[PDB]
Amino acid sequence: GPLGSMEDFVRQCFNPMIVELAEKTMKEYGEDLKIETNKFAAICTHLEVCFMYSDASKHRFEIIEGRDRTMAWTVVNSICNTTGAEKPKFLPDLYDYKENRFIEIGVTRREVHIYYLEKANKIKSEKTHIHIFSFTGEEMATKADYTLDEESRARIKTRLFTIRQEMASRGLWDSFRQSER
């Protein structure tokens, strides 16, 4: 069976805006997508999920993810000044204007409860909401509050399942799943 290249797959699978934002993220962090290509795919996947999460309720969420880091912090600080929300210690992915809280979106190939616990230990915040997705349909969220309804989250889960299936068809899934740290 042919083993495809992950860079080929990423450039064929994600829309060009997502690919370009992922390229800029990796440049900002001094990473080379041509070598760390599983990470390139992971960054693209996380961007796509953040955008889908926002699109599930247009106008409800401010998007923080995808922006360069300086601009992202400028947006976080603006939200905090406007809404009175407490400033997060690490850059979150969205701000929810309805529930008045920042959100960390996780997408993982590891077990979602462990990943959830790791993220909650990292950000160390009593306000920021965490929502973890896997590629096989499992999810986990702060206080069992999943924010979006079943139809919206099913759309996200189906996209993730499709990505995993297309990776597997190209012989890419085994390495992509194994390489997460």
Residue 107 binding Mn ion, by CB under 5 A? yes
Length of the chain: 181
Binding-residue total with Mn ion (CB under 5 A):
3
- What residue spans of the chain are helical by DSSP H? 6-13, 16-28, 37-55, 69-83, 112-123, 150-169, 173-178
Query: Segment near Mn ion (CB under 5 A), from 39-47, 70-78, 147-155, 164-172?
Result: 39-47
Q: How far apart are CA 34 and CA 25, in angstroms?
A: 14
41 forms part of the interface with Mn ion (CB under 5 A): no
- Rounded distance, CA 37 to CA 81, Å? 38
Write down the least CB distance from residue 106 to Mn ion, Å: 4
Active site residue 149: no
Q: Helix 6-13 vs helix 150-169: angle between axes, to the nearest 10 degrees?
A: 140
Work out how close the CB of 69 gets to Mn ion at its nearest, in angstroms, rounded to a whole number.
10
Q: Which residues are catalytic?
A: 65, 93
Q: Which residues bind Mn ion (CB under 5 A)?
A: 46, 106-107
What residue numbers does the annotated binding site for Mn(2+) cover?
46, 65, 93, 104-105
